[PDB]
Amino acid sequence: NAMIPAKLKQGDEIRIIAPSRSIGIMADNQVEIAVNRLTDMGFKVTFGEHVAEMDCMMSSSIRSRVADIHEAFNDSSVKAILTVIGGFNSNQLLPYLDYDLISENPKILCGFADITALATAIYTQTELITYSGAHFSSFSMEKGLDYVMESFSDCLLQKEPFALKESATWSDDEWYLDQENRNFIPNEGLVVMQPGVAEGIIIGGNLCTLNLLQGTEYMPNLAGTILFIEDDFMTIPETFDRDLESLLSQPGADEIEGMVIGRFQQKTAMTAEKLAYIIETKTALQKIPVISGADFGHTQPIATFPIGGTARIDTNQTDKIQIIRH
Amino acid sequence: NAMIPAKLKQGDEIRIIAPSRSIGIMADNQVEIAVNRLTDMGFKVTFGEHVAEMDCMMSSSIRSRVADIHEAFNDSSVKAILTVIGGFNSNQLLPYLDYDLISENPKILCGFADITALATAIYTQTELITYSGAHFSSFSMEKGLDYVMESFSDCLLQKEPFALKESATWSDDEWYLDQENRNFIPNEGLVVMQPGVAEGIIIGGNLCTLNLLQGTEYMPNLAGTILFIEDDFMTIPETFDRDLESLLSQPGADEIEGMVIGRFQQKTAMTAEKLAYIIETKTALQKIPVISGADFGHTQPIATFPIGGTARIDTNQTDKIQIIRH
Numbered sequence: 001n002a003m004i005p006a007k008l009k010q011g012d013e014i015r016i017i018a019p020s021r022s023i024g025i026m027a028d029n030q031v032e033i034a035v036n037r038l039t040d041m042g043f044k045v046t047f048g049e050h051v052a053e054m055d056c057m058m059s060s061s062i063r064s065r066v067a068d069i070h071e072a073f074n075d076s077s078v079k080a081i082l083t084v085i086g087g088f089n090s091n092q093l094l095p096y097l098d099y100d101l102i103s104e105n106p107k108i109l110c111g112f113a114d115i116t117a118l119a120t121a122i123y124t125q126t127e128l129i130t131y132s133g134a135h136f137s138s139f140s141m142e143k144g145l146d147y148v149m150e151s152f153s154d155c156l157l158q159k160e161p162f163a164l165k166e167s168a169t170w171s172d173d174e175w176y177l178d179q180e181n182r183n184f185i186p187n188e189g190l191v192v193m194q195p196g197v198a199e200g201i202i203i204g205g206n207l208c209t210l211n212l213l214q215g216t217e218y219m220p221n222l223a224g225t226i227l228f229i230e231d232d233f234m235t236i237p238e239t240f241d242r243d244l245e246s247l248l249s250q251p252g253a254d255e256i257e258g259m260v261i262g263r264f265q266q267k268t269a270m271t272a273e274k275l276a277y278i279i280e281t282k283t284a285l286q287k288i289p290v291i292s293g294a295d296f297g298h299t300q301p302i303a304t305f306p307i308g309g310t311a312r313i314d315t316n317q318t319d320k321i322q323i324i325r326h
Numbered sequence: 327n328a329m330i331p332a333k334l335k336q337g338d339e340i341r342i343i344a345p346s347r348s349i350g351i352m353a354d355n356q357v358e359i360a361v362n363r364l365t366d367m368g369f370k371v372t373f374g375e376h377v378a379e380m381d382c383m384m385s386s387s388i389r390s391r392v393a394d395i396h397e398a399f400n401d402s403s404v405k406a407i408l409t410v411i412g413g414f415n416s417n418q419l420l421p422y423l424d425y426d427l428i429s430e431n432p433k434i435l436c437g438f439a440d441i442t443a444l445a446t447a448i449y450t451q452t453e454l455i456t457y458s459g460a461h462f463s464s465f466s467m468e469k470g471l472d473y474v475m476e477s478f479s480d481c482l483l484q485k486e487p488f489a490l491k492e493s494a495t496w497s498d499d500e501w502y503l504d505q506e507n508r509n510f511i512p513n514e515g516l517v518v519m520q521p522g523v524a525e526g527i528i529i530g531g532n533l534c535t536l537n538l539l540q541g542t543e544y545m546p547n548l549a550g551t552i553l554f555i556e557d558d559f560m561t562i563p564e565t566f567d568r569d570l571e572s573l574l575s576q577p578g579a580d581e582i583e584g585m586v587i588g589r590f591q592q593k594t595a596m597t598a599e600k601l602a603y604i605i606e607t608k609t610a611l612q613k614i615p616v617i618s619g620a621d622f623g624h625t626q627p628i629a630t631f632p633i634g635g636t637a638r639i640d641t642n643q644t645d646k647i648q649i650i651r652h
């Protein structure tokens with residue numbers, strides 16, 4: 001069964017790697033804040049040897065990112081690994097990873113969006129539980145951050161079940177470019193789209209990214225899972241639909257226990273009607289409960305949750321999402 | 327080998343269907359144009375009962391689309407089926423299609439883009455050969471069609487080999503909105519990115535669409551195939567890359583014979599340099615011919631080619647892409 005890596009504790013070292021886009025797209029100023037932020041939380045922050053390498057795709061070579069990953073896992077002082085930022089190409093690295101090395105060195109790996117690929121592949125090949133959550137760059141956000149740290153802390157510094165609470169406010173701002181002028185919005189809350197109750201193994205993160213593992217070794221079976229699914233502003237409802245239909249045609253999809261969907265960005269123009277239409281036409285979702293408007297995805301603020309950890313959904317309760325194993 | 331549907335004779339009936347987006351996204355006069363065009367080419371044009379149904383996704387219900395599809399294969403006056411246009415959701419239809427009925431009513435199905443899903447699936451399930459080529463709506467283009475009819479005719483009215491020939495000019499115009507103010511461009515032609523000779527089965531069409539069948543029983547094995555791939559302006563170099571990585575990780579990708587890539591649209595901003603870097607990082611393409619800039623995809627003009635047919639690629643000839651079986 002699944003390996004829960006040791007929770008972080010004060011003084012632990014945290015390694016920053018860039019398996020997707022280069023730390024070079026972050027301004028010197030942003031780096032400083034995130035460093036200090038995690039340092040104030042009580043951690044030695046260190047950086048992979050190649051984080052700053054940059055090519056024409058704003059990323060770096062396969063061999064470089066692979067090495068930073070292996071070093072990070074092989075270094076025993078490192079208790080958690082944080083990705084710099086997402087991007088597009090972490091799926092390139094999958095064939096080249098020493099999964100024996102990784103399973104021999106269980107520890108936290110956390111990041112989201114493109115990192116879904118890497119994180120999911122490591123769970124499926126290794127059974128190490130990984131995390132969909134804050135990037136390193138996530139901690140460079142001056143306003144609204146409290147929720148991020150609280151969920152990051154609930155998930156990674158403590159071990160008891162916790163609830164994926166609804167934020168009080170949420171936003172959809174390009175905050176790295178403008179940090180003072182933000183637009184927090186009262187969170188109208190989660191939205192029950194299909195009622196029910198269930199319990200299961202957590203799979204998901206970024207939908208179009210998880211699609212990429214379909215037909216590979218690295219794809220997890222979906223039997224007995226709660227799906228936590230999200231996508232960014234590039235997806236429109238029609239692309240979300242086709243990408244979801246694809247996911248729900250994969251092995252184990254007949255036996256999905258439920259789904260939680262993260263808040264969409266504004267440009268996606270997802271509406272309640274469209275989302276309802278999309279879900280209502282999916283066969284594998286017919287009986288199980290489904291929620292939308294959760295605090296993970298590309299809006300602020302994000303939670304941090306385990307891929308390969310367990311959850312319970314109860315639509316009648318106030319706190320609808322409970323994380324149990326994590 | 328596969329089955330080849332009867333080539334289109336003269337006066338033969340053509341049924342138009344809308345398995346993706348509805349015909350309601352076409353202006354009345356744009357349809358009048360395509361109808362006259364295909365009539366002049368000497369065919370009886372008819373429309374499925376449901377082609378004008380229209381939902382909030384600019385498409386139509388599953389069961390409507392599936393009915394027009396079945397009524398069209400089963401009607402024996404009908405010798406070719408053309409899709410109105412592409413979009414997003416032809417992959418929804420796949421579990422509901424009567425493949426046995428299709429298998430015993432062999433005939434031409436042609437269209438491209440989203441239709442890649444429908445066409446490929448029909449092929450993998452019935453091994454009836456289908457076509458990536460003109461939509462009904464493709465025949466409403468006033469300027470620059472001559473190439474399109476010619477390729478259409480090469481593929482579907484004649485039985486002998488032919489070359490997927492370089493066009494003299496090409497464009498990337500919103501021509502349905504401005505039929506007169508076009509912007510033709512002299513075609514620098516096919517780039518040989520990797521030289522070679524190779525022969526195999528043609529698989530491909532729209533890349534992110536073909537991705538959607540991955541991990542399903544509708545996915546073709548890729549052993550002994552020539553991949554003809556293509557994507558539209560919504561893809562950027564990084565997304566073309568991750569989608570390509572994902573395809574070249576599928577069953578059979580270790581035994582691909584060669585690859586042809588269709589001309590990118592301009593908003594994609596694919597540079598010869600980026601494309602080369604993307605290709606050289608792909609393991610499955612190490613020792614095989616790869617050609618770029620071909621005449622298919624989302625620029626005009628478009629060629630029509632068979633899915634499940636056969637092609638020879640010869641970097642030494644001046645006719646470098648040959649379509650043998652169709």
Ligand SMILES: Nc1ncnc2c1ncn2[C@@H]1O[C@H](COS(N)(=O)=O)[C@@H](O)[C@H]1O
Nearest residue numbers: 025026085086087112113114137174176
């Ligand atoms: N320097 C930067 N450049 C671009 N985006 C930056 C950024 N810093 C923070 N974000 C943020 O990171 C998110 C993108 O996440 S992802 N898909 O994992 O890469 C966006 O919400 C940006 O606002």
Ligand SMILES: Nc1ncnc2c1ncn2[C@@H]1O[C@H](COS(N)(=O)=O)[C@@H](O)[C@H]1O
Nearest residue numbers: 351352411412413438439440463500502
């Ligand atoms: N009425 C219309 N509305 C939108 N696009 C139209 C169009 N007529 C032609 N195209 C065109 O046909 C292509 C779309 O094919 S596809 N991806 O398979 O749906 C694009 O190049 C459009 O410009």
Ligand SMILES: [Mg+2]
Nearest residue numbers: 208211534537
């Ligand atoms: Mg995809």
